[PDB]
Design a protein around this ligand. Structure first.
Ligand SMILES: *[C@@H]1O[C@H](CO)[C@@H](O[C@@H]2O[C@H](CO)[C@@H](O)[C@H](O)[C@H]2NC(C)=O)[C@H](O)[C@H]1NC(C)=O
Ligand SMILES: *[C@@H]1O[C@H](CO)[C@@H](O[C@@H]2O[C@H](CO)[C@@H](O)[C@H](O)[C@H]2NC(C)=O)[C@H](O)[C@H]1NC(C)=O
Ligand SMILES: *[C@@H]1O[C@H](CO)[C@@H](O[C@@H]2O[C@H](CO)[C@@H](O)[C@H](O)[C@H]2NC(C)=O)[C@H](O)[C@H]1NC(C)=O
Ligand SMILES: *[C@@H]1O[C@H](CO)[C@@H](O[C@@H]2O[C@H](CO)[C@@H](O)[C@H](O)[C@H]2NC(C)=O)[C@H](O)[C@H]1NC(C)=O
Ligand SMILES: *[C@@H]1O[C@H](CO)[C@@H](O[C@@H]2O[C@H](CO)[C@@H](O)[C@H](O)[C@H]2NC(C)=O)[C@H](O)[C@H]1NC(C)=O
Ligand SMILES: *[C@@H]1O[C@H](CO)[C@@H](O[C@@H]2O[C@H](CO)[C@@H](O)[C@H](O)[C@H]2NC(C)=O)[C@H](O)[C@H]1NC(C)=O
Ligand SMILES: *[C@@H]1O[C@H](CO)[C@@H](O[C@@H]2O[C@H](CO)[C@@H](O)[C@H](O)[C@H]2NC(C)=O)[C@H](O)[C@H]1NC(C)=O
Ligand SMILES: *[C@@H]1O[C@H](CO)[C@@H](O[C@@H]2O[C@H](CO)[C@@H](O)[C@H](O)[C@H]2NC(C)=O)[C@H](O)[C@H]1NC(C)=O
Ligand SMILES: *[C@@H]1O[C@H](CO)[C@@H](O[C@@H]2O[C@H](CO)[C@@H](O)[C@H](O)[C@H]2NC(C)=O)[C@H](O)[C@H]1NC(C)=O
Ligand SMILES: *[C@@H]1O[C@H](CO)[C@@H](O)[C@H](O)[C@H]1NC(C)=O
Ligand SMILES: *[C@@H]1O[C@H](CO)[C@@H](O)[C@H](O)[C@H]1NC(C)=O
Ligand SMILES: *[C@@H]1O[C@H](CO)[C@@H](O)[C@H](O)[C@H]1NC(C)=O
Ligand SMILES: *[C@@H]1O[C@H](CO)[C@@H](O)[C@H](O)[C@H]1NC(C)=O
Ligand SMILES: *[C@@H]1O[C@H](CO)[C@@H](O)[C@H](O)[C@H]1NC(C)=O
Ligand SMILES: *[C@@H]1O[C@H](CO)[C@@H](O)[C@H](O)[C@H]1NC(C)=O
Ligand SMILES: *[C@@H]1O[C@H](CO)[C@@H](O)[C@H](O)[C@H]1NC(C)=O
Ligand SMILES: *[C@@H]1O[C@H](CO)[C@@H](O)[C@H](O)[C@H]1NC(C)=O
Lengths: 309, 424, 49, 98, 167, 48
């Protein structure tokens, strides 16, 4: 299934307090009214950040797995949260292909070379991104298909890990005795701050022509008139490189076909001039035992120009 | 193909519908309602065959309006048609008249600003301050250019209001042949001393060197000039502007003023009650129209936007590695820091010089307006003019000044004929 | 200097309320006008001389 | 101003000097012009009692030009710009209304 | 279009150009401010009427022949013979020209309304309702306004009309 | 400029073109503001 977001995935772009100031910011957000996949599991791509919402009073989501290979022989991130608190950890793991008395934690079976440790209905939103080796998490837990409203998310962690991520999975608590996945794109918003310094509203500056007018004017109320907001630029397609033909193919055809060659001690010497050239007959000749080219590569013998051959 | 893109909106307080004009783009190369105009392709509005008054101007005779729950395009109408029943022995002569009162608003002065060049460019930095010595006398030019136009701003307000030698007062018995002037005369029970109408006019409207200087004349001082002009024209007519103020009763002043436009004086004296009733209602309508002033708000907004832009140019690199002078020099190499700081100085100096050039160009516009306002003060308030349309629409009788925050508002009283009949 | 924030001005008790992750505030036009003391966790305004 | 103050007589207030414009004479100055403005200024006013019209034979009489003044015991017609009284006659006035 | 002039659609230059701040916003505001006043300047010179006045089908007037300044339906855009003579004598990278709001036809409508108003009602329509008066009498009032008596017009009506038509 | 220079060397040459072309375009617009005041003054005389 797929659903329609409304105004979700807006987080505080940075520190810096602020008052009544319609501030304009450019960053990685979840676009407003976007197409978010729905899951009720398989390895998903990363590509640039992730939006992750969910709904449920109990706690079905039992951590995430991130990284490039999601396997051993290389380090990865693992985030779990038991009934105590969140545990960030970065080791080399060996993950079960299906990870999940009251005994638990059958997720991995190896934790080598740990480079980071840490210990300590309802809507639980997260924003994940990974920039310059920093893995950021924003979150907020607000009590009540998702509803409709606006709520800005605050920083949770600051993790100087260094980890690369291209794919991730999720972890669920099974029965033995619902979540969303969006992605972030570079967009521009106009953010409205209240006197307490919180974000109360936003405008997506890449949606309906009216929003582009609001963003250019730095307002949420536009007065009647006509406004120049942007520009139209037709784009070119295809790249055609035209050129001459040949004519004086400058006949290699005899120096490689001379019926009477010359003994080595008195070797012949033919100098090409400003004529046509086409080495495609040499490289593609088909019959050859040794062909080694030292100055330039054998294929770039046409993308160059020399004086005396 | 390239071109601008404009957004046509009825206002967010009316609807959220919108139409888009692609300027000089053919309607086959854009990627419902598509309308081709000589100004480009209009999409999202329907074109009708009727003709309305222009609301939102599109161009080349085409306008848009929000009338026919949607958005439409149309060729604006210039006005209603009227054929005049001309013949060679027919005349139309009025049998009645109305008194009309209209307003006119003019900016007189603007905000006096100065910028300290050293705090803008360097900002408490000794390495930069010494480098300013290698550019010569640029700051000398900057201070004189802004000061030379700041002095004129006080001159502009003296020439409009200080056109009377004495401070005239009205008698306590505020009652003039039946005319009620209490909305234009000072009301002894208000902030400072404004008329009830001036209260609408005033109620409706240290960073890093960027300093704002106060005007020489305060708003209380301008109110006192305008109340003296009002007292003179009601008690003394137009005599105080050519010598000593000479008293004459007001009913007799109005009779002279009718004579000056071609109306005999008996027409006033036998209808005195009607003209006083019409005047008193016409003045009372002014407060409804005020409760307009865009000619004054534009001056404040244009200068505020220039001051904000000047500050924002302090975050440009202008081809340096950092915008902060305490950064470059600290982490780099002095020989290189000097060249990069000189790039910041040059870029910021060019911004500041652009600011000054635009203030001189804008100062000429305010002076041109203030010269017109001074001319109207003498020719509309201190006398009766025959210049067509110069002192309001209709046959000029009289004018009363009102003060505004950075300008002056004239109340023009004109005579307009009505109810014509046919004669041979 | 507040852990990197370099400036000049008079420090006074403020009446702003930061969020529990924010160090300093800026005004409109993006200039720092308040900071939080790292040690005492109090917000101070930074007017100019 | 050269056209309107020197080549003619203007009624524009304060355009050709202070007072009632009579005439002007130009003088040449370096990079400029100097105007010598000749004006009419009234002086030495007296106060009088006035009335808009006069009744005679049950009819209202209005002045053709001027104002009615009273010196205390008798009424006269004067021109508005210079005190010069004449007796009120049927050739000085016109009749309109009752 | 600031970017198209300075860089000309090149991503390396246009990204470096961003380092100079907002000069390209100032350029647009300056040009917009003077491009809007061009229609305001024209609007305030010609839109001095509320109604669009038309002349009568007959055209005797009094001897005057204003046919050289009044519209001619047989000419392009219904201009006058003199308005036609006047219009008979007098693309790239990021540069465009905006059309005026008032077309030439609309300007001809303003001038024909002023011309139809004055020939039939004189100056009365500029102070109120248009009041008709015969043209010959309008000229006599105009002489009175300059200190000439009325009989000088009425006894020389053909002479004044002949001098006007020839001029 | 983008074909016979490495990126650290081509940036310097692009800034020279931006500065020159920006200066010329900014001069163009200033001169139009100065002429625009004159046509407006003429239009006010024509309206009068
Ligand atoms: C030397 O000459 C021979 C024959 O004259 C060339 O052989 C030709 O090779 C091309 C490519 O395979 C064939 O399509 C032709 O049919 C061949 N010629 C004949 C007559 O069959 C050979 O290419 C020449 N040497 C070089 C270096 O070009
Ligand atoms: C004023 O115009 C009217 C027409 O509108 C003139 O009446 C015409 O007079 C001529 C003779 O001059 C007759 O031949 C026509 O038959 C009349 N027309 C009508 C409809 O009766 C009138 O003569 C004009 N006045 C002057 C002084 O020229
Ligand atoms: C001239 O016109 C005015 C209206 O503009 C007339 O005055 C109005 O007359 C009506 C009818 O008697 C009254 O109900 C209104 O109250 C009057 N208005 C005012 C402001 O007094 C006036 O009667 C007309 N004069 C003539 C001679 O017809
Ligand atoms: C002149 O008009 C003013 C209003 O602009 C009149 O003042 C009002 O008078 C009535 C009757 O006393 C009161 O109910 C209002 O409250 C008054 N308004 C204000 C603002 O005080 C005034 O009476 C008029 N003067 C004459 C002589 O008629
Ligand atoms: C004076 O008389 C003329 C006719 O000579 C009147 O003209 C009328 O105008 C209206 C439009 O306003 C037309 O619909 C009528 O057909 C005209 N009538 C005639 C008989 O042609 C004109 O209205 C009169 N003026 C006044 C002030 O009453
Ligand atoms: C940093 O350390 C200081 C002590 O050096 C802490 O100051 C204490 O603050 C609390 C209130 O928050 C007071 O009740 C204590 O009495 C203070 N201690 C002293 C010795 O003055 C300060 O709270 C610490 N900051 C943080 C963020 O933990
Ligand atoms: C005309 O009479 C008025 C009084 O009705 C004179 O004004 C008075 O002038 C005296 C002398 O300057 C003052 O002391 C009084 O206060 C004035 N009275 C008022 C009510 O203002 C005026 O001076 C007389 N004009 C002439 C030429 O004598
Ligand atoms: C007002 O002026 C008249 C006229 O000068 C004075 O009245 C007298 O009028 C008779 C003729 O009816 C003359 O013979 C007298 O010579 C006049 N007397 C004077 C003194 O001029 C009248 O006196 C004047 N009134 C006042 C109050 O001065
Ligand atoms: C108005 O006057 C013009 C002349 O100024 C008349 O037009 C010309 O008339 C002569 C004959 O007298 C012709 O030979 C020309 O060809 C005419 N010119 C044009 C352009 O047509 C015109 O006929 C007069 N109008 C009226 C109604 O009498
Ligand atoms: C999201 O896009 C997919 C195609 O990538 C489409 O099948 C799906 O219907 C879309 N979802 C919505 C809510 O439009
Ligand atoms: C919670 O999980 C962490 C990580 O596995 C572990 O170190 C910690 O002991 C757990 N707490 C309890 C009470 O089991
Ligand atoms: C990581 O662990 C492997 C053994 O699994 C070891 O050989 C290697 O030295 C470790 N790397 C570091 C940086 O400790
Ligand atoms: C992440 O992968 C990129 C290649 O996609 C590589 O160039 C980069 O060095 C990696 N980052 C880290 C921190 O290993
Ligand atoms: C938060 O803002 C509300 C208004 O939205 C205000 O009433 C309240 O006092 C603020 N809270 C604080 C702690 O300043
Ligand atoms: C603007 O909105 C207000 C309510 O906020 C309303 O009273 C007013 O009529 C609206 N104006 C228009 C033109 O719709
Ligand atoms: C757009 O192009 C078509 C031909 O493809 C042409 O017929 C039409 O006139 C063009 N429109 C304009 C406004 O030039
Ligand atoms: C407008 O009228 C023309 C004829 O003059 C007609 O062809 C056209 O269809 C009409 N337009 C509409 C929208 O009805």
């Amino acid at each position: 299934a797929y659903t329609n977001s409304f105004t979700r995935g807006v987080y505080y772009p940075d520190k810096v307090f602020r008052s009544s100031v319609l501030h304009s910011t450019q960053d990685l957000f979840l676009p407003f009214f976007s197409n978010v996949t729905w899951f009720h599991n398989p390895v998903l791509p990363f590509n640039d950040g992730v939006y992750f919402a969910s709904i449920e009073k109990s706690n079905i989501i039992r951590g995430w797995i991130f990284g490039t290979t999601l396997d051993s022989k290389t380090q990865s991130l693992l985030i779990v949260n038991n009934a105590t608190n969140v545990v960030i950890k970065v080791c080399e793991f060996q993950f079960c292909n299906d990870p999940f008395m009251e005994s638990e934690f059958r997720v991995y079976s190896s934790a080598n070379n740990c480079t980071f440790e840490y210990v300590s209905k309802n809507l639980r939103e997260f924003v994940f991104k990974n920039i310059d080796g920093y893995f950021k998490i924003y979150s907020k837990h607000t009590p009540i298909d998702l509803p409709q409203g606006f709520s800005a998310l605050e920083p949770l962690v600051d993790l100087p890990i260094g980890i690369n991520i291209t794919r991730f999975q999720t972890l669920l608590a099974l029965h033995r005795s619902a979540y969303y996945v969006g992605y972030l794109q570079p967009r521009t918003f106009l953010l409205k701050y209240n006197e307490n310094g919180t974000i109360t509203d936003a405008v997506d500056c890449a949606l309906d022509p009216l929003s582009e007018t609001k963003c250019t004017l730095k307002s949420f109320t536009v007065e009647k008139g006509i406004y120049q907001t942007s520009n139209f630029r037709v784009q070119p397609t295809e790249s055609i490189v035209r050129f001459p033909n040949i004519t004086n193919l400058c006949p290699f055809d005899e120096v490689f076909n001379a019926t009477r060659f010359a003994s080595v001690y008195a070797w012949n010497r033919k100098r090409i001039s400003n004529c046509v050239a086409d080495y495609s007959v040499l490289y593609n000749f088909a019959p050859f035992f040794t062909f080694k080219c030292y100055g330039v590569s054998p294929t770039k013998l046409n993308d160059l120009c020399f004086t005396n051959v | 193909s390239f071109g601008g893109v404009s957004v046509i909106t009825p206002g967010t307080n009316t609807s959220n519908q919108v139409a888009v004009l692609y300027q000089g783009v053919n309607c086959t190369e854009v990627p419902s309602n598509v309308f081709q105009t000589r100004a480009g392709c209009l999409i999202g509005a329907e074109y009708v065959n009727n003709s309305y008054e222009c609301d939102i101007p599109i161009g080349a005779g085409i306008c848009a309006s929000y009338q026919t729950q949607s958005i439409i395009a149309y060729t604006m109408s210039l006005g209603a048609e009227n054929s005049v029943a001309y013949s060679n022995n027919s005349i139309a002569i009025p049998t009645n008249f109305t008194i009309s009162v209209t307003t006119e608003i003019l900016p007189v002065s603007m905000t006096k600003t100065s910028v300290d060049c050293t705090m803008y460019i360097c900002g408490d930095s000794t390495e930069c301050s010494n480098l300013l010595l290698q550019y010569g006398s640029f700051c000398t030019q900057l201070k004189r250019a802004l000061t030379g136009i700041a002095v004129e701003q006080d001159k502009n307000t003296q020439e409009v209001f200080a056109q009377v030698k004495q401070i005239y007062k009205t008698p306590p018995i505020k009652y003039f042949g039946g005319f009620n002037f209490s909305q234009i005369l000072p009301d002894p029970s208000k902030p400072s001393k404004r008329s009830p109408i001036e209260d609408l006019l005033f109620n409706k409207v240290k960073f890093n060197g960027l300093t704002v200087l106060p005007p020489l004349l305060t708003d209380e001082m301008i109110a006192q000039y305008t109340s003296a002009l009002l007292a003179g024209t009601i008690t003394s007519g137009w005599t105080f502007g050519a010598g000593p103020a000479l008293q004459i009763p007001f009913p007799m002043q109005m009779a002279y003023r009718f004579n000056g436009i071609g109306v005999t004086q008996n027409v006033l004296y036998e209808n005195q009650k009607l003209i006083a009733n019409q005047f008193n209602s016409a003045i009372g309508k002014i407060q409804d129209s005020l409760s307009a002033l865009g000619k004054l708000q534009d001056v404040v907004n244009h200068n505020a936007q220039a001051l904000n832009t000047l500050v924002k140019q302090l975050s440009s690199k202008f081809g340096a590695i950092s915008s902060v002078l305490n950064d470059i020099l600290s982490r780099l190499d002095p020989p290189e820091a000097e060249v990069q700081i000189d790039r910041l100085i040059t870029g910021r100096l060019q911004s500041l010089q652009t600011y000054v050039t635009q203030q001189l160009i804008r100062a000429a516009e305010i002076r041109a307006s203030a010269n017109l306002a001074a001319t109207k003060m003498s020719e509309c308030v201190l006398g009766q003019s025959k210049r067509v349309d110069f002192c309001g629409k209709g046959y000029h009788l009289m004018s009363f000044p009102q003060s505004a925050p950075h300008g002056v508002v004239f109340l023009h009283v004109t005579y307009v004929p009505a109810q014509e009949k046919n004669f041979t | 200097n507040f852990n990197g924030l370099t400036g000049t001005g008079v420090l006074t008790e403020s009446n702003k309320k930061f969020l529990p992750f924010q160090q300093f505030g800026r005004d409109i036009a993006d200039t720092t006008d308040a900071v939080r003391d790292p040690q005492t966790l109090e917000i101070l305004d930074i007017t100019p001389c | 101003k050269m056209s309107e103050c020197v080549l003619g007589q203007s009624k524009r207030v304060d355009f050709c000097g202070k007072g009632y414009h009579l005439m002007s004479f130009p003088q040449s100055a370096p990079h400029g012009v100097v105007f010598l403005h000749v004006t009419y200024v009234p002086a030495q006013e007296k106060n009088f009692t006035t009335a808009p019209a006069i009744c005679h034979d049950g009819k209202a009489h209005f002045p053709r030009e001027g104002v009615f003044v009273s010196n205390g015991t008798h009424w006269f017609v004067t021109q508005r710009n210079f005190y010069e009284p004449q007796i009120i006659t049927t050739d000085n006035t016109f009749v309109s209304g009752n």
